[PDB]
Design a protein around this ligand. Structure first.
Ligand SMILES: Nc1nc2c(ncn2[C@@H]2O[C@H](CO[P@@](=O)(S)OP(=O)(O)OP(=O)(O)O)[C@@H](O)[C@H]2O)c(=O)[nH]1
Ligand SMILES: [Ca+2]
Ligand SMILES: [Ca+2]
Length: 164
């Protein structure tokens, strides 16, 4: 009943990545990662309260599950940070999925106790597995893309590419 307890513990990251890299290499299927970080979450908590912040974490987590498949993986990575491992998603599909998550969250209109719509957005860094055996390199490049999405103004998806 609590979507937060349905997210995978980040302890499972090495386990799942090592498995999925092997599967991808055998079958030739794309593999990618999204790192997702709630925008201005400190301001959300300061304005609407810690409890409202916690409800928002559920709303965004549910958006993740509603937009990915059971063959994808969703992890709680930090206080307001999440990782999604997407299997069988090309670069175009990866960006499409990320944009859908971003848009669905942006259009989520939660009501505060005063009837005011709470503004909410998130930023996403996306990257494709490029073949290096260490999954941690893939997380690093996705995180670089996430930082760029933030610096550009948030409420954004950025795909890692060399020209950045
Ligand atoms: N309600 C709630 N807040 C949390 C939690 N875990 C971490 N945080 C809050 O999440 C806030 C994250 O704020 P940052 O300063 S790291 O960044 P922002 O999200 O405000 O800004 P960016 O858009 O990420 O630059 C912090 O104020 C934390 O206290 C949590 O479990 N529940
Ligand atoms: Ca952060
Ligand atoms: Ca944040």
């Amino acid at each position: 009943m609590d979507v937060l307890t349905k997210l995978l513990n980040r302890r499972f990251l090495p386990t799942i990545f090592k498995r999925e890299i092997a599967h991808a290499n055998r079958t030739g299927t794309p593999l990618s990662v999204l790192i997702i970080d709630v925008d201005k979450f400190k301001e959300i908590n300061d304005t609407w309260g810690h409890n409202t912040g916690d409800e928002i974490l559920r709303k965004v987590s549910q958006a993740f599950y509603d937009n990915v498949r059971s063959s994808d993986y969703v992890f709680r990575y930090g206080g307001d940070e999440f990782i999604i491992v997407l299997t069988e998603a090309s670069e175009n599909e990866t960006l499409r999925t990320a944009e859908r998550i971003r848009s669905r969250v942006e259009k989520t209109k939660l009501k505060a106790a005063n009837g005011e719509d709470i503004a909410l957005s998130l930023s996403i860094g996306a990257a494709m597995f490029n073949g290096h055996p260490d999954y941690e390199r893939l997380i690093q490049i996705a995180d670089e893309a996430l930082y760029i999405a933030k610096r550009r103004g948030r409420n954004r998806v950025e795909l890692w590419k060399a020209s950045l």
